[PDB]
Each structure stands twice: as C-alpha cells, then as structure tokens.
Symmetry: D2
Subunit: 406 residues, 4 copies
C-alpha cells in the first residue's frame, strides 16, 4: 500500500539530529553508566542536585540541527536512568522541576524546533532503572510509562513524534502497546511513533542497523506501510564520553547518511551534550562537515527515493529518484591533478547503471554544475557516465550527478 | 652507528605539528592551487594585497602545539607559490613586509616556540613557482634559494631545523646541497636538516609514507645515522580546503601517531590555517582528541623505541622500549559492558608477544592503573596478557600497558 | 531437549558424500539442463536409451566414500528430470529397468554401503518435470511421489535416510508431509529425514544449509524436538557433472569447510557428479584423495568432536572440538617451517590462545606427527596459550589439529 | 626497445609446463628435503639406487603438455640435490646412467618435445648440495657447472632454453656469467636464457617472478635490451611432489593467474611434481585437464595477445589483450545464467566498461559460444561498454573472453 501522509512527510525529513542529555552527562562516562558501572542508585540520583542546565540553549540545539541539514530532532526526555527533563506534573520527584534548573527543557525544546521549522521528537526509555515498579510491578510500571508519555502528549501542543527504547529488555512481556499508542493517537494523531527493537499496528517506523545492506522492509503487501530509520553516534557512546577518542571519520558519517537514503530509510546522527547542556565542540565539527554535504545534496536528500536502478559490478554507486529527476550517487572518486601531478581522478571514469529506459538530455554534478558525458542503450536500459574526479581542493565523499530528461 | 646528539634529541621530540599557511590559504582550495588550477600568476600573486595575518597569533599556535603533546612545529616559511612569510631583507618584494600584515611572522613564530619550549622548524619549498629563475636560470635560482635560507639561518637565533620540499621536481639536477647544507651548518650547527623525497651527508632525517609497514632504515652500517619522519594531514589537502570533507577519523590519527613510534619515526600532524592565519575549528577538534591520547601516552611517546618483540598472529599490537620499561601498545580493543549488556570487551582477551625473556613483576594500563594478569614462557620468550577491555565510557583506540621488571 | 538416538548417530557421521547421477549426466551441462536450457522433453527423455550404467560400480564408489572418510552417501534416486535409478515396480516406465542398464542401481548401492559400514541415503526430488501430474493434478502427483518413496522404504531393507528437495517450488501448497513422513516412519522408523527448504514438519530430523555457510546452527525451539544441521558443498558451481565448469573451489577451502561444519555443530555433504555412465570423474577423485588424507588425520575428532564454549584469541580463526576424553585445538593459517637461510613463514614462536579451558593439561600434541607443543595456562581465567609450530617442510594440512591430554 | 625475434617467439609461447622430478620425488616431502630436513647426505643419496624411472614416459608427458596448451616444458635436469637426469659423460657418478634407470631422460624428453612441437627447456640448479667444490673451490665449481651445461648444449640438438636457479645463494660472488652464457650462445644461439634471482647479465632474455604476482613487468632500462618476464605457480606449496601438502590452489586461481600473466606481459609456468618413478600424479592431471579446457577456448588470444593501454572500469578486474587483427576483453567475476524462476546470479544486464578504444567496432562475441554482445562506444573519450552476459547454465570459464571485430 501507499504510506500514510505523516509517514510520507517523515520520509521527506531524511536526516534527524539525536541529542543525548541526562544526569549521566555530568559524569562524561556514557549514558549507561549507572548500570554498567554498578553505581549506588541513591548516590547516582544525587546528580539531580547539580543539574543546572546552565549552558542549555534550545535555540543553539535547533540551530545546530538546521546547519547540519536535519529536519527533526530527537531529544532524550527520559533515559534508562529514569530522570525526566520535563515537568511530570506530580508523577515523579525525579524531574527537572526538582533540580536547580527549574525549567521545562522539553517546552524550550519544542519552541526552538518550531521556530526553525523542525519537528520535535521525544525519546522515551521504556526500560527504567529509577522506579521500583519496573521490576516489582510491571503492570503498574506500564501505567507509569504511559502517564509519562501522556504528559508529553498533552502539555506541549503538536509533537512530531515519539521514539521508544527498551522493550527489548523484556522480549516476552505484554507491553500494552494498543493502549499506549492508542493514547498517543488520541492526543497526537499525526505524531510519528518509532519503536527501537512491527510490534503494533500503530508503529510508523522501524529501526535498523546502519550496516543493513539491502532496501528496508516496508510491511506485507496488504498491510500498513512502515518507514525505516538508521542511527549513528560519532564515537562509541551516545551520552558524552570524555575519554572515548574513537570517533568515526566525517567521511564515514557522510557515507552512512547517503546509505540510509539508498536503502529507503531516514538517519539520526547523535550528539551527547555536556552535563550542563552544551553542544561539545567536537560535535560542532561533524555538524559543519556533514552540513556542507547536506547543503550540496539538498535537491535529492529529502525527496529522493530508492528506485530499481542498479550500479555496475564492483561499484558502490546508487540512484535516487524524485518526480522530476534521477540522481547518481557516486562513491570512490579521487581528486584530479595535472599531467605531471597525478592525484588519481584524472582518467576517464565510466560508471554504469541499469534500469534507465528514458532518453536523457543532460547530466551535471550538483557541487559545481559540470556537465558530464554519457551514453545510453535504451533497449537494455544502460547508462554510462564519465564520472569526472574532484576539482583539486575539494572532496565530497559522495558526489551527486543530477539527470535531466528530454 | 650512534645518532649524533641533535638527532637523538630529535627522535625524543616524537610528535610535531605541521602548519601550512600562505596566500593559497585565502582561496581555501588547497596549497597547490596556483599550478593545478592553471591560475594566472599575476592575478594569483595579487593575494599579497589581502594578506593581513589579522588572526595569526603565534602564542596561541604554540600553546595548541604544546597541548596536543607536540615538541616541535614545522611552519611553511615559503611554499611552491613562492611567497615568503618573513622579511627577506631585499631578496624579494614577494614577502610579508610588502603585504598589509607588515610583520615578520617567522620572528613571532620562533619567539612563541621558545616561550613554550618547542623547537621551531622552517619548511622551505625548493620547487618555486614565483621566480622565473626556477625554470629559466637554475644556477641563479639555487643562489636565490640559498640566500632565502641564509636569512633564516642568521636573523632569528638558534633554529630547531629545516624542512626542504621539492628536489623531486628535478630528480636529475645538481642541487648543490654540499653548499646549501654547509651554509646551514656554519650558522646553525645544531639544526635538524630534513629533505622530503640520503641526498647529502648533512641530512639528519629522511621522510617516509605513513603506511610504511616495517621499521625504517637508519643508513648503511658504517655511515651516519639518519632519523625518519612520517606526515599526516587531516583531509586530502595540506593547505586549508573548505570543500574537502574527506577527513580521516581521529582514531586513524591516533593509530598513525602510534605507528610512527612503532617503526622508529617521528610524526608530523598537519593543519592548514585560514587565510588570516587562524587555526580552523575542525583542526582544534583533532588536536583536542589527539592531545588526550598523547597526555596518557607521555611515559612512552617520547622515549619509546622499537624493539625486536613481535605480536601474536592476527593482531596489530606492538612493543615500545624505554631504558626502564617495556610498553605494550594494544589495538582493536572493545568496550566492556555487563552480562546483560554486551559491548564486545568482556571476555578474557589473551594478547601475546614474542621476544620478552625477563621475568616480569607487574603490568598495568596507563589510562587507569589497572593491573593485568599475564603468563610467561621465558625459554621461548612468550608473554600473554589478559588485555581487559575499555571501562564503559572510554575508548583510547591504542591502549598502553606498562611492564615493570623484577 | 537432547537429540534422539538416530540423530545423535547422524551427528557422529560427520561427513557424507553426495552423489548426483541421472540422465543429465550424459550431457555434462549440469543437472537442471532439461529446464534451464528449454530442452524438448521427448528428445531429452530419449537419453534413457543410452543409459547403460556401464561404468557404475557401487562397490568402488562405497570404497571411495569410505576412503574419503565419509560415513554416509546421499545418492540421487530421482532428480527433477524425473528418471528413477531404481526399479519402481511398475510405477513408471522412466526408470533404470527400462534402460539398457537393466539393473536396480539402488539395490547395488545399498548392498555396497552395508558392506563398507556406510549408511545409504536416498535423495528424492519433489519438484518433478517428467510427470504432467505435477502441474495438472497435484494431489495425484503427491500420491505418485509418496508411492515412489514407499518403494524405497519397502524393497531395500533398513535405510539410513531420505533427502527431499523441491517443496520450495510450490511454497504455498500443502505437500501432505504428515502422510509422506508418517509412511516413512512406519516402514523405516530409524531413517533420518531431511527436507531441503532453500522445520517443515515434526518428523524432520535435519535442517539444511545449501551453498551458504552460516555462523550457527538452529537445533529447534528450546522445548521442541532437537534437529541436526547439515551443510552441502559441491566442488564447482554445479551438482551434476559439468564439463566446462572450470570454477572449482580449492581443496583447501573444502577442508576448511569440513572443519567449519564441525565447529558449528553440523554435518557436511561433499558432492560429486558422476559421468553419464556412472564413473567418478577424475577431478572428483582428486578432491576425494586430498580430503581423505585430511579426514584420516582428523579421525580422532572428526566424528565424535562437538562444539564447546572455548573461544580463540583475537585475530585467529582457530577453534576447539570436544570429545569425552580430549579437547582438540583446530588451528588455521599456519605456515611451513624452513631454516635460517630458507624462511617459508612458520619458523618463529607462534602463540595461539584459547579461553575456556579450566583443567590442568598434561600434554598437547599435533595429530599429524605427534610433536609435543609447549604451552602455558592461567587456570583462574581459563587461558591456554600454545606455541603452534609450523608445518614440517613438505606438508601442509590447512587445518592442523592438536590433541590435549588432561592430568 | 622491442624484443629481439627469439624473445618475441618466447612471448608467443605464453604458457609453459614446469616439471620437478629428482631423487627427492621418491620421498614426496618436497624438493628441498635433503637440506631443510637436515638429512645425512650419504643416506639421502642412496635414493639413486632406486631411481628406476619405471613410469617416466616422455611422450605421454609431452602429449599432456600439448593438451594443456603449453608451448614449452621446463624440466629439472639437476636440482639442488645435485643429481643429473642425463648422461654427464664422465662429469659425475651422480647421474641417471649410474641409476637402474640407465636411460638418458633428457634425450627422451627433447625427442618427445620435438614430436609435439614443444620447446624443451632445461632447468639447472646453480646452488648445488652434492659437489664439495661448491664451498671448497668455487672457481672449480663454476667449471663443473659450466661443463654440465655444455653437455646439455652439445648432445641434444637445438634447445629451447635454460632456466638457472641458485645464484641468490651467493649474492656477492662472481658467477662468470659472460663466460657461461657466452658458451650457451656459441652452441645454442637461439636458446632463451632465464636466470631466477628472487638483469644479472646482458645475455639474459627473461626475468622471473617466482611465487609472487606483481601488477607490472620490468622489461629492462629504456635504452637497453628488452627482457621478457615469466611468472611461476605451483599447484600447492611445494614444487617437488609433496604427498601431505593438501594446500592446493583452486583451478580457478590457476586460470586467473594464467590470464593475469598475459595481462601484465609475461609468460607463465605451471608446475607439476612427478612421482618418484616419473609419473604425472593424478592431482596434477586434474589441474591440467581443467586448465586445458580454458587454454583451448582462449587459443585465439593466449599466444599472440599483448598488453595494450586500455584499462577497465572502476571495481572490475577485467582487462584487454591486443592482437594485430583484434582486441579481446578478458572478463572476470561473471556468474551463471538461470531462468526467471531459477536465479543463479548472471541474468541481469552487466555493463563492463573499458577506456582506450578509439576505433568504431563492428561485432563483439564470446569465444566460448559465439554469442554476440551488445555494446556502446564514446569514440571521443574512448569508452567501450559491453553487456557481458553470464555463463550458459552448465559452464563457468572463470575468465571469459570476448573478441572485438573492427570496422
């Protein structure tokens, strides 16, 4: 079937920014610290006393997303640690209104998203380490969880979506999703519901591993269409981790964003804020670099969809389709030098594709408007382009050629 | 043969910061732009008129180098473009004193290096695109080159070294190195001479490709010992290149620093300044991350030397030797979770080495002082350590265990 | 659940020989030729008239299987082409009794297997190109299929097993497996039933992994019947003989695949395609000779050895197999030992580590030459490190096996 | 510089058969056994007493070489062990005339080669373990070596070439090659001289890459004599026969190595080790049968084809070979074609591109079945793109060859 309108709109977002921020951030040793480091719960939960949010500016967060070319932001409203970054209106004492911050961060967040035309999404951990209900009274925990979501559904106006994480902790339990998701549909009919593991008809989006090779499953031929989403964090941790030096290359990040679109998914890129809610400078660097790429890729990043056009043997190239154009996404290009300074990209570089049966008028690189030479066999639907290398002084990692039809 | 004292001192520096800054920086399309983009020379050289150096602060640069754990800085005093960043005292109009900057940047540079206990090195391009002498009167060009170096030898006090680049452009010419290097020895007996391509007895250091697998040659058995040096830049270009998004991972940078020491070389890490002489934000990020690693690695980074101790099959681990300790440099480690949360590092992880014949007392990770369990076969010189994984919230990329002997 | 006795005995077989032989073999262009080459059915089926079986010697085949270290043989009794290599007792004219051969090859086959202590298994294609019943009256086809199997169950004595192939052609149909397999259990209670699916019934004993090599075997849901696993490899790209298929795997890959099967707790079938007249072709003999040397050396662990929670150190493909009296280190990526002047790669000390051994060890020795290995243990952390010496010059076993003897 | 005529003729041979046979063969643990296994020389050299050559038939060997598509054979006339397979006419007692064989095997060899139109080449080890002169009196050893070659140059008629091996053992010695090779040129002006050193003299015609496969061939300094190149492959890890070396390469890798040699402008020797009594072992026969199918198919280009500055698309291992009338696309990594219902991998359109062809093309066709290929050209940028169709079911050539016909 056809995607519901809100899921079409979701797939058009393309790229989101994931933001991890909680009490864990003050320790800068990763978001699972309370459990994995076997911390004393009483002592860990005292971090609420120093949660000032002194450097959280939701406008700067929203601006970061805008600059990277993201169209939505997923904020951690409550992680496994169980601390709420919003006013739970009496549900819990373990929330930002009982911290020196005394600010509803979610309220600030939603306002900042709307000012930048971004959808606000709320991450909610369903595996909870704070409330004894989780282990001691799971049905009552489900009521608590659902109430926590109800607050997010009812106090902030329209919400882009919800991002649930933790049902995997009790794979065999009845999580009462008809009632949780049904409550969401009542207050937030157009919210996107994402469950990180379909576990319920009301799910709109399924999550996958970034190295999923093949196109995404969209559901059975006569069932509801569900979108897909991949996630990457810049190092090994999601929350800030000061001694995690194992950052990915910006090149891998770009390739992963491209790859998401290739397989018909969205992608979240994650940053972990500091204890006080600042975007770390390391993250800003990744945002600037990916942001250059996404600005260049704008004509296809959002509306582009996978299409049955494959690339030749031995190539990682791929094709994205919009209603007016096809786009060749071309990888493993090298920089062009001279006759006596050779950087690798100077030879004619035929890249082929199978599945285009219409005569083409023009093909051009989005980065510099260079027109490419090509040949077609329309009977067998072959396209071969001379994919010229990068002008010296540039390297886009994934280069994009726009096809214009006759 | 034994290294001369200045070469011993050089090998103890370990890590240097390479800085590319010239007129090319204003175009932000790489340092070879004038040639590779077939620019009109007159028009390109007009960039001198906008060379203000308005954001060059040598003290900040020196401080950054100190913080990243560098012990020397190689600054581009004149690149292929042929513009001098110092007062050529009559040799050329194409220098910083004929630009609005009106400051001897090399003078600022050496003062700042000395304040931070760093050795200043001068990069000098021997392949020159500015002077017609280069092609049309090579003997006169050699005199010009030599005079340009003489200025550097005589007007700035003691100089850590010279880094020459371009003899490869005319492989078969007589470059009159006895007289160039002899002049350097007269005024700067303790300068390190590096020629990038041994091309002369006075050479102290040879350069290698960062992917050199094996320990480097130090010269024929009865001749002068020469050191080795590798270089890495963060993306594909050396000068700043705004649309080169193909940055290497911080992890690769760390591994390359470690690798240099493994093969008995120094390593330069290169940044390209902005047009006005600022360190770009992206470079700051790589320097912050590497700086955390080098601070942890300080007990071995400087004094550590290769030693005939190899690692077991299938690992990239290696050993570095100081007079009192050996150090296991261990790669491809994973982070430790729980029984419920598996991140990869939780099993016992036997990493073996061959070549240690002395009984060991204690082995401990430099990052957290955890004591490691081990076994030895002293007859066959096998050491096997349980290389425990990273504490959750950390990842050093290259982890270092110090061995203490009985 | 634990394996039924017949499935335990099956897992002890370890290695089987798969044999593809039918009319297709005369054309030597693969076993799917009739369909994939769009052959005229009348003209293709005339190959029965030249099916002499003139070089089929079941005794020699069984001997060769024994020598390669196989403990069972899966022979194609009828492939998709629909020709039966046995006397169908009037079910069909399209069988060996209507060919000049005039011999029940399956009868010769099972006699030969029994003489060599091998289990005979019968491959039976369930997707059938010969009888028009397959498309025009599927229920009647199922009766035909079932009767073809019934003959095999009733006229040859005890049968090691059945290997069904083709239900994947009609993924949505009711194949009436309760009745097919129930009939088999009536006449052949101890037969292993294998269905190649590309668990389809409670009576299934083995699940198949054809031309894919996975990392773990499915043994069934934790409270259901245990089923074994089996991997199948053919030497080139085809199963039937294919004269211009030059794309043979290395004998080294075959040995590694056999070892790998055992590592993950499966059996492995290695497939050969006979010539038109039923000879083992020379290329297959070569792979059999080479594998046979390996399996003879590996015999102490190949059959009884089972996977065990003992892992190998980072960066190695080594593994451990367990018998009731010994553990065995299966060690890969070794090189040959030369001298100081001739270095071939294997001469240095070569520490290979394992995690999961908690008992003090007395002696460790290579199966191929009884060389004693030096080792160290940390019993608290269950670490074993051996100096895995390289191959003596003139040998290379691909997968080398060290036997551990305990205190 | 272009190759002298005899070196052009050598480059047209394309493929040779390397044959290792000596006393070592009886032990079947590799040809270096005497040294590497630290054997007592007296005891090892007793093997002469059982050297019967009872199964050496040079005619059969030459026929096999012809059938595999080889155009020359390099036979070990004397290996490091120092035993001569020919009548040394009094130079040594350690020769076949002092063994029960009592036959000049080299004489049989050259006769058989000539009957089959093959060039006989003589391998001669220059590092010699038998004569004490080697270490005790190197000048006298050089005379001995030279005399041994003189016999080969004078008693067997015209000789295709000499293949020397061992100067690497004394890298700094004066081997007096002007005099050795000058003696060869006196008696055998057209002999190809190969020296394995892994240009040591002006008279060298061929440089080797033994057990290493590069991406370009050195043809000598730009203004000096052109020297050809030759790659060597053995089927397992040893050159002499090695019964417990199971680490055989795939037939596919052998075919790809043959193709690769031609791509980079070299010949290739494929090596077999005979049994103790001089038989081709069955394993070697298998590789020869399979390679022989490929070389028969490839005959239009294997011999005359040369490298040409035409490169293949990104991510492809394809390449081009040039004859005076045609170009040939050598295409790798193809898959077999099934049906709509049976997908084996090769069925989709498969554009394989090349850069460097500037002439309009008339027809392109696969050598194996004459199928005509569709293609497109951009003559300005010299791009050719072919739909490289997959293998017909039942075949897989590993390296498939399309012949281009020009306008």
């Amino acid at each position: 079937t056809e995607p519901l309108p809100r899921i079409q709109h979701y797939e058009d977002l393309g790229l989101g920014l994931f933001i991890h921020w909680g009490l864990y951030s003050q320790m800068a040793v990763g978001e699972w610290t309370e459990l994995i480091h076997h911390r004393n719960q009483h002592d860990y939960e005292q971090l609420i006393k120093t949660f000032t949010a002194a450097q959280f500016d939701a406008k700067k967060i929203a601006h970061a997303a805008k600059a990277v070319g993201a169209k939505y932001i997923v904020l951690t409203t409550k992680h496994h640690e169980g601390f709420f970054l919003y006013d739970t209106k009496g549900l819990s004492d373990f929330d930002v209104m009982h911290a020196p911050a005394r600010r509803d961060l979610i309220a600030e967040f939603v306002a900042a998203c709307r000012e930048e035309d971004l959808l606000p999404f709320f991450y909610m951990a369903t595996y909870d380490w704070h409330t004894p209900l989780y282990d001691d009274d799971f049905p009552a925990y489900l009521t608590y969880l659902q109430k926590s979501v109800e607050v997010l559904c009812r106090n902030y106006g329209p919400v882009g979506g919800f991002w649930f994480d933790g049902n995997w902790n009790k794979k065999d339990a009845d999580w009462h999703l008809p009632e949780l998701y049904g409550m969401i549909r009542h207050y937030q009919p157009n919210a996107i519901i994402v469950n990180n593991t379909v576990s319920d008809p009301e799910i709109d989006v399924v999550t996958y591993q970034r190295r999923t090779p093949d196109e995404i499953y969209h559901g059975a031929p006569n069932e509801k269409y569900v979108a897909g989403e991949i996630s990457i964090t810049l190092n090994q941790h999601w929350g800030i981790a000061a001694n995690d030096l194992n950052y990915k290359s910006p090149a891998e990040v770009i390739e992963t964003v491209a790859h998401a679109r290739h397989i018909g998914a969205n992608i979240l890129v994650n940053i972990g804020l500091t204890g006080t809610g600042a975007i770390p400078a390391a993250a800003q660097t990744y945002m600037h670099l990916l942001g250059r790429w996404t600005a260049m890729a704008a004509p296809v990043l959002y509306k582009g969809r996978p299409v049955p056009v494959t690339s030749a043997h031995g190539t990682r190239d791929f094709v994205l389709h919009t209603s007016k154009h096809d786009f060749l996404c071309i990888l493993d290009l090298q920089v062009v030098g001279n006759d006596n300074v050779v950087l690798g990209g100077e030879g004619v570089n035929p890249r082929s594709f199978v599945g285009i049966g219409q005569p083409i008028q023009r093909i051009h690189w989005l980065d510099n408007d260079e027109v490419l030479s090509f040949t077609q066999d329309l009977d067998k639907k072959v396209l071969t382009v001379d994919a010229t290398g990068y002008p010296y002084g540039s390297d886009w990692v994934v280069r994009i050629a726009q096809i214009d039809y006759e």
